[PDB]
């Protein structure tokens, strides 16, 4: 290459963080959000009530964990769905949260715990 090397990118995270869920005829723990314009979504991110990602200073407004990879340019999620989906209550998830800069993980975890969401420690 020009610099002597070339990288084509890594693989996006796969949806496997779910360990337990209230299996119900209608999704009991899954909610759907209208995607925000020009916003990239990846598995493990934390969303507010209106679909915007939680940022520093409002960790108390964490609402659900995203479990869908969304592409802003296509305005389409992988598997070709039109909406973002996240777990908003009553589930056990792997501890692989993705947080914005300066976001306190402990506050987010405490806020989500009030909704019956528990995180299982993950090894190296």
């Amino acid at each position: 290459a020009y610099q002597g090397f070339t990288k084509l990118g890594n693989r996006e995270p796969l949806n496997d963080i779910i360990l337990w869920e209230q299996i119900t005829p209608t999704g009991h723990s899954r909610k759907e959000y209208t995607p925000q314009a020009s916003t990239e979504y990846r598995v493990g991110e934390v969303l507010k009530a209106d679909g915007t990602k939680v940022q520093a200073g409002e960790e108390a407004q964490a609402d659900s964990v995203c479990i869908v990879n969304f592409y802003a340019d296509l305005q389409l999620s992988y598997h070709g769905q039109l909406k973002v989906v996240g777990i908003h209550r009553d589930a056990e998830l792997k501890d692989l949260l993705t947080l914005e800069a300066s976001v306190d993980a402990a506050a987010v975890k405490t806020a989500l715990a009030a909704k019956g969401i528990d995180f299982v420690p993950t090894g190296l």
């Binding site: 209608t26 999704g27 759907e32 479990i67 869908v68 598997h79 769905q81």
Partner: protein
């Protein structure tokens, strides 16, 4: 019956149809009656209209 509405594949939502209806009714009936009689007073000394005797 109505039309189904599309749902998100990963959301796992769904809809359901409503039950049916049943009811009962009843009817009366109509009754008719007629009465007639014959007496000898209508036969004696009565000439047949089409004849003379």
């Amino acid at each position: 019956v109505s039309l189904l509405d599309a749902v998100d594949r990963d959301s796992r939502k769904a809809e359901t149809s409503a039950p049916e209806r049943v009811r009962q009714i009843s009817f009366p009936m109509m009754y008719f009656k007629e009465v007639e009689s014959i007496t000898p007073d209508e036969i004696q000394g009565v000439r047949q209209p089409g004849t003379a005797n």
